[PDB]
A paper describes a structure:
AMPA glutamate receptors (AMPARs) mediate excitatory neurotransmission throughout the brain. AMPARs associated with TARP γ8 are enriched in the hippocampus, and are targets of emerging anti-epileptic drugs. Here, we present high-resolution cryo-EM structures of GluA1/2 TARP-γ8 AMPAR complex, associated with three diverse TARP-γ8 drugs, differing in size and potency - LY-3130481, JNJ-55511118, JNJ-61432059 (herein referred to as ‘LY-481’, ‘JNJ-118’, ‘JNJ-059’), occupying the same binding pocket. Modulator selectivity for TARP-γ8 is determined by two residues unique to γ8, Val176 and Gly209, in the M3 and M4 helices.
JNJ-059 was also captured in an active state, with an open channel gate. When focussing onto the gating core, opening of the M3 gate was still apparent in the presence of JNJ-059, although the gate constriction point (at GluA1 Thr621/GluA2 Thr625) was slightly wider without the NAM (by ~0.5 Å). Therefore, even the bulkiest NAM does not compromise an open gate conformation, underscoring mechanistic differences to NAMs targeting the core receptor (such as perampanel). Based on a resting state structure in complex with JNJ-118, it has been hypothesized that NAM binding precludes outward movement of the M3 gating helices;40 however, the highly similar architecture of active states in the absence and presence of a NAM suggests other contributors underlying NAM action, as investigated below. Unexpectedly, one ligand (JNJ-61432059) acts bifunctionally, negatively affecting GluA1 but exerting positive modulatory action on GluA2-containing AMPARs, in a TARP stoichiometry-dependent manner.
Residue numbers in the entry:
A (entry chain A), B (entry chain C): 389 to 543, 565 to 771, 779 to 815
C (entry chain J), D (entry chain I): 18 to 53, 79 to 185, 196 to 234
E (entry chain D), F (entry chain B): 393 to 549, 570 to 773, 783 to 819
The structure:
Amino acid sequence: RTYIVTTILEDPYVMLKKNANQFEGNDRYEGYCVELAAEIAKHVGYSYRLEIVSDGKYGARDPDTKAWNGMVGELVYGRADVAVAPLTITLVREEVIDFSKPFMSLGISIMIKKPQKSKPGVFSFLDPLAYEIWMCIVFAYIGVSVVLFLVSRFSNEFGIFNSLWFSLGAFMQQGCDISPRSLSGRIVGGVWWFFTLIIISSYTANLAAFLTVERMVSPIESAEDLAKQTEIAYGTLEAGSTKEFFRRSKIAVFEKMWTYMKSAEPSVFVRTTEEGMIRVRKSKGKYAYLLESTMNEYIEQRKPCDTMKVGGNLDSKGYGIATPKGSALRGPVNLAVLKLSEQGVLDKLKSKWWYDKGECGSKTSALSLSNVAGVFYILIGGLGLAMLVALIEFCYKSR
Amino acid sequence: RTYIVTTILEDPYVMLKKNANQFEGNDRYEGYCVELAAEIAKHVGYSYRLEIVSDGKYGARDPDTKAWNGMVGELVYGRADVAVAPLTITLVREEVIDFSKPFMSLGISIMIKKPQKSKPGVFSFLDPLAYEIWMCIVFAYIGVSVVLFLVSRFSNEFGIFNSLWFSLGAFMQQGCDISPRSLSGRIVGGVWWFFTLIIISSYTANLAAFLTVERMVSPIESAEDLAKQTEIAYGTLEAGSTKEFFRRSKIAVFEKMWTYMKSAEPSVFVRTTEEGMIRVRKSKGKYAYLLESTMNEYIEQRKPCDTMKVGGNLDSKGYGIATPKGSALRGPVNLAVLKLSEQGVLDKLKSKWWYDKGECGSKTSALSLSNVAGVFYILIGGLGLAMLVALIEFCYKSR
Amino acid sequence: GVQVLLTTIGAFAAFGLMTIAISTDYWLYTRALICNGGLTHSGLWRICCLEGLKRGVCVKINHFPEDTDYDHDSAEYLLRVVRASSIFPILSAILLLLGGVCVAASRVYKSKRNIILGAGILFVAAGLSNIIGVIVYISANAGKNHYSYGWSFYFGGLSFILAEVIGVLAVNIYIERSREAH
Amino acid sequence: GVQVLLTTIGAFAAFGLMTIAISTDYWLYTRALICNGGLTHSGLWRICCLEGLKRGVCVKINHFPEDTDYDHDSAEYLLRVVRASSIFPILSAILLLLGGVCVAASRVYKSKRNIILGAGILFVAAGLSNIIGVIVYISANAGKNHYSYGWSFYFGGLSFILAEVIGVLAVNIYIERSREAH
Amino acid sequence: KTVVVTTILESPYVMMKKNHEMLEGNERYEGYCVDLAAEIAKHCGFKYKLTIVGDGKYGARDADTKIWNGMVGELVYGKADIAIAPLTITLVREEVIDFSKPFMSLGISIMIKKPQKSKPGVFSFLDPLAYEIWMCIVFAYIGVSVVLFLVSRFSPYEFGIFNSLWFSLGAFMRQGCDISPRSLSGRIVGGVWWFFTLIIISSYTANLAAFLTVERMVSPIESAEDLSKQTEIAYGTLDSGSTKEFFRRSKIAVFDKMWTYMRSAEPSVFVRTTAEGVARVRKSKGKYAYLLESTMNEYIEQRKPCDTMKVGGNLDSKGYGIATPKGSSLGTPVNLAVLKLSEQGVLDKLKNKWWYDKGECKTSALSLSNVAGVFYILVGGLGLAMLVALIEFCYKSR
Amino acid sequence: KTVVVTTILESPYVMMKKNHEMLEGNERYEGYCVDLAAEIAKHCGFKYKLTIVGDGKYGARDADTKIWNGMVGELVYGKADIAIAPLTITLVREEVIDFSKPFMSLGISIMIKKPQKSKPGVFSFLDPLAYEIWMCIVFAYIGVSVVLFLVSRFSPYEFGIFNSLWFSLGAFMRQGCDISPRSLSGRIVGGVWWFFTLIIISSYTANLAAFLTVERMVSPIESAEDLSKQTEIAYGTLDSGSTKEFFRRSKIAVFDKMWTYMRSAEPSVFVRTTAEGVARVRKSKGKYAYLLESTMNEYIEQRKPCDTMKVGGNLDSKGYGIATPKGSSLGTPVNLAVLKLSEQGVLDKLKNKWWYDKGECKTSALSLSNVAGVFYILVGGLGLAMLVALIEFCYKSR
Ligand SMILES: O=C1Cc2cc(-c3c(-c4ccc(F)cc4)nn4c(N5CCC(O)CC5)nccc34)ccc2N1
Ligand SMILES: O=C1Cc2cc(-c3c(-c4ccc(F)cc4)nn4c(N5CCC(O)CC5)nccc34)ccc2N1
Ligand SMILES: N[C@@H](CCC(=O)O)C(=O)O
Ligand SMILES: N[C@@H](CCC(=O)O)C(=O)O
């Protein structure tokens, strides 16, 4: 006799295979819970027929009608004999259905849209100074070289070319083969020296500041961080255990969060997890979805993986396999679950469905060649240019 | 008819004049409360006779006998008609005596013995490197100069003197009038250059670290900071309002503090404020006296002024003038007090008795000439030595 | 001979470039809350908006107030006066004109060899004034959203480069003339 | 003539200073938990306490273990071996002895002028070994309470200074001899 | 049975709830004083109805009619029985009504428009060293050059005064000149100068990033005396308040001068409401200052738009005190309630909730405006050099 | 009426009060499990007496006698009725008794002696740059010297290979050599080399303080595989516990190898108590490792003497679970009590109180040991130079 298996379509626990329309039945579905149920049936020795919860809601109680919706609704009212879905365990649901021992842990987690990384380019060594400063430095170098040539020459080795060489070597603090002997040339040299000293000191200090700094600041970084602010609105999934957890909380922070959520215009509550994921992804940093750590990690791992988890889990709980109260299946299922946990099976499944995909692989640390490759490219360009000019001078000298 | 005035001997509110034995009566005493009472009597139009509380305790109730000790004891039982002393105002005392409007504010404050300042000397610019490094630098300079002279000479301008000059200029990065042409001399020069580069970079980096750092870390810096630790014991003054405040507290931190204090071996409670002041001053950083902010500030101002106040005041309250319940003096006294506060009198008295004495006057800030005067002294010494050697060379050349 | 002609054409080209950049109003490409901010191609004198409600209508600027009208005679007011007057680029243009005039007059009186020397000095001073002008222009605009520079900017820069080159050439001409004198 | 005698006496003085410092045990003045820490005047080989229960009794040191006996062949064990053996100061003394011997032998065979050159090289190498020895000595003692150095330390330093001076003088002598040869 | 409670809407003490049109009863009022009255009535047990004053004034007396306005007039004339309000204690009001022990402390203070951050100024590169250090540096440069000059003239083994200055300057800027001393006496001077430069330049370079990017906020007034000195800047107070009475009844010279100014400063600097002064300061381009209690400034500076600031310290110290009419039986228990709340720590919690909980208010690449002064200096030096060359040319030509 | 409560003294779960000789009743026990049992009995309503096990063992079964020891044997054999303890859930124990939902999560972990901090090593001055950067720097030095050589031979206006290398080296170290290029092609190379040196040296100098003073703590084992590979280092577990059973019943290769080692490693690595393993690790000079639950390691590392550390991650994940005998009426309500406590957040508060609240665990001038390697390099270079000079002298003399 086949056993009904109510589930829910939430990746990666359950998903529709590529080309699902062609496929049918259990073979169409694929996800963590699928392998979990397969293994459970193998260890118990029965056969199961998959089925989805029509409402698509995990499960909850209508306070007026006092009825159960979702997968718990199906299980209580005899529709389904088993619920292999990620049913969070709570006091209210455990009164009416027999949960099994948890097969995974989690907690309430905060999601945010990934801020701009501000990745450093190859020419990251110019960052400490504005490009404006660099170019005005070049222009000042030309001006001072010309002035030096002029004052020195008109009634000496200080021609224009040697003037440029002298001023360049002075800026780089590599000394000079020649130095001014006249008063005007010496004034120019001293002023250029002062300018060089100031500018180079500024560059070095600002660079030290740069390399001893990272953009690790988080917008909220705490639960009360969500409460204090108002530009970003935080909400949950309707008919989800976190909604009840906030509803029945007895803490100041959770009371305030529940007050805000219940009196949020427009309705912060979302119909489905993907709804909140897209809301944050398209909120321009305006939504702060509250969900379970597992989904948050999976999403932060999947491409575009443009979302991040912030803060520590508010509370600790775990999923669990459910059966109807008084069902004969409760006994062995626990046992099976334990087997898996002690056999490393659940660990392998978690690793497979959360890490193998690996869409994106995203105290003082040494500099990487990427930070400073631009100067190497500049060096190669200069060497090539020097060889070219050597060839040109060779041709000119020959002719 | 003279009015009895019970007080207490705690500086600076009340103090014994120098050569007190010669003096007698009110003229022997001097302190803030003395001028306060003088002004109060002048504004009211009566005369007063000073008197001290024999027990020396501010005031409290024996829970068994249910009697009052101290100044409050004297006032309740008719001994004294007025109490101009710094009586902290509380619910328990206000039931039985008529306090007046507060004439000063305060709060519970934490005292600690002043840690070592680690004042910087004139030769503070050598701190980034150990003296060992400097002296081994000198010895390496000598060794490398000798090796250079040697390798260069034996089968050149690289004599011993010029070798020392070259190596010194290389270390200071001021260039060289001459440079090695031989292989061995060039190896020596390159190695000395490497050493100089490493050492100077280290000095500059460590100096930047030094100048961007100050010793502002506090041992506790909070009330719970006292609770967590145990090497330092914190206690109060027996028969003082702070003891009751801790006794009747309803907070976790205050409950823990009261538990520790009541179960402290040996008895943390002190007989008098000077007792706790000396206990902290001679505890080698083992006692953390809890008192009122006014006394803490006065002591932190008075020589040796080797004590510091830490953290923010735990609670807010103020002193007050007291009279017996049902006394006719309650009415005008309040008025007088208010007059003073609105006339600036109390402000002037506070400033006088807390700031005029001025025993000791103890973000990025420019360097002071004190930080870097040692190098100036070195420069002057070198100039004098140079003149002396010039004279010696002049005499030698003449002869 | 050829060198003097190159000097003259370079001087006139630099003068034309600098005058164009001064009169032209395509220096800066920034967004401002001055047109119904929105994309705007500004200039040294007048700020002209584009792709907006006006889509071509534009006006001068209130450099001295900047809508603040505070902190008078505080070393920032002087910068504002200099920026508004644009005295330094105009001085550069004047110096270029006078230097070109002196170079041309050199052909008239070849005996007086100091004329080209004065011309070269004027060109160098023009370069200095130009660089000061761009410095103050950039320093004033600070009073952070995206921004960019237009072709009048680079016209002024080219004027400066030409001025430096022409100063070099004129000095060389003076050296050659004095050497020929012996 | 006078210069050679000064060379010889300086060499022997440096050798005596270095040997004294090696044999002597007043290098470091620190407190340690080795005597019933308490004031202690240590040395290169043996650590001797003072103003304590022993008040004069003292023993050698376990340089290699240091009571840790871990991390073998990890670039720190080599430092410990070098420090314990004190091979470098001993090498300095040996080199000083050989250099003085060569200088003395120079008087025997004035024709062979390279002897003093070898002596000067030996003195310089002795200086290098001495400075290495002090470096390793200081680096090992790190393995923070007050500390201070004694007169054997400065005796070794004086040995180094004399070695440098003597190397200079011997090289000068070689130059003079070869110049006289022409 | 119910108690007549008087108040005013001086936030955050008393302020209406959002969408209060649908709110009825005492629930339409939220704040610090509403809470306080709640616990006071709890401890004493009575019942209260929260009522505002039509005159919208804290209270004062008219020197001609000898009549009382606002809360004080209400309580004295029987229209109410208690005032759990931000009412300020003073001598005059105590003569007619009975206050309690203060439930929060305060002092007068000054409110001004927040100035625009002072962008770092030209010559900012001299900041990391005190001017005395620069003077000593110049003196040492002169002295080293002179000593080198004397030593190389008297005892030589060429170093004139000009070339000696050139050498010292080059050594200071880490540029080696062509000539180097050859005498021991000159070389000693060179060595010490080199060491001096190493130390000084390293110290200067270490702390140079800070002094270039920091913008300092400085106000034209730093205290009350600076305000009295400046007559162009206008200052005023609430029309009927302890502040105006305190200035009027004062005997200190500074406050008497302020009172003369206010009594003569046309137009009337006085306002009718705190928010009026807030707006006036926010809408006067920094030409106006407002004198008020420090609690309101602390609340405002902690709340957006955060376009204003508190300057200086507190001129006088006072406290807010619950009030009751003479002979009331409520006066005795309210004092005990206040003391009990203070001991319990409730008042501190309320203060933190309504003041701190409402708080609403980096490595950057250097900008050319930061280092434009050195460019100006450079160009000036170039112009000076050309001028000097022309002068030398003319002198030689004659 | 009273409930039989079984526990063990595994701190901080259960630990006796100080001076307990004068303590009587359940009050002599303090900890996390005692509190938990308190709230469980409160919610359920029953009464409890806290009792320790004489055998002092958590529980296990003997494969020969098929007998149960410790708590499991007690509950199965009727000596008690409940275990509010740090008992670990597992398949075998569930077959015989009924557990609850876990009240705290954990995993196996490894305990080792904290190594002495690795003082920074010789050649620490190369750290701020990656070795690839150094290799590219050397290649660029060679290339620049070669290019200068070719350019100055083919198209001159002397720069041999030797002098070219000297010039490049001097430019890299901010020392100017006597010779400078005179040709445009050579001067371009010089300029780009100068810019390269400026950038590289500034970058190196910026982050140099950190890499000189940092002490890095590194363990010989970084994971379980590294432990299995190393046979000299000894590891053991508690004799009767879920850890030993888990290793014994495992089927993974790594754990099977570990089990063979333990079953054969003489002397018996197994201990009888957690504190025994703590002392053994603390008294073995880092030659011993202990496998235990992560909660105990977190407690210990957070408590003085803080002479030990946790290494790696958790091999397996499990949870502590209250237990009751088969068919007990208490089993149903204890589950609900645990869930209610979890929802209320009590368990988190207890965890923080008994773990985090018990926590018991700068610019320094450079020491010569930090920069001794450069001195060694210097002296080695000097010796090499003297040797080379002697070799040249001999070659010339022949
Ligand atoms: O009257 C004037 C106007 C002027 C502008 C300049 C100039 C130039 C320039 C000009 C002409 C060229 F042919 C090439 C470059 N670039 N430049 C920059 N930067 C380069 C590109 C920018 O986007 C970022 C930084 N910052 C500040 C100034 C500046 C130089 C002199 C003068 N004199
Ligand atoms: O075998 C040896 C032993 C030795 C020691 C030294 C020496 C000397 C020294 C020695 C002899 C003198 F005449 C003058 C100075 N001072 N010194 C220091 N410091 C000076 C004073 C200290 O208190 C703080 C820092 N640190 C490390 C080493 C050192 C040099 C060479 C050698 N070779
Ligand atoms: N409550 C205060 C307000 C006065 C003021 O704001 O200046 C009073 O009664 O005077
Ligand atoms: N409570 C655990 C302890 C085992 C261990 O410490 O390894 C058990 O019952 O197995």
